[PDB]
Ligand binder design. Structure first.
Ligand SMILES: *[C@H]1O[C@H](CO)[C@@H](O)[C@H](OC)[C@@H]1O
Length: 27
């Protein structure tokens, strides 16, 4: 199990890699 700063998804949303998702522009 590992988690990163920010993971992009669909080139619009981000994830904590732990189970969190939120709209982002690019960490
Ligand atoms: C967190 O680090 C892990 C190291 O093994 C890696 O497997 C995982 O890949 C989603 C994530 O980068």
């Amino acid at each position: 199990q590992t988690c990163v700063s920010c993971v992009n998804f669909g080139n619009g949303f981000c994830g904590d890699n732990c189970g969190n998702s939120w709209a982002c522009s690019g960490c």
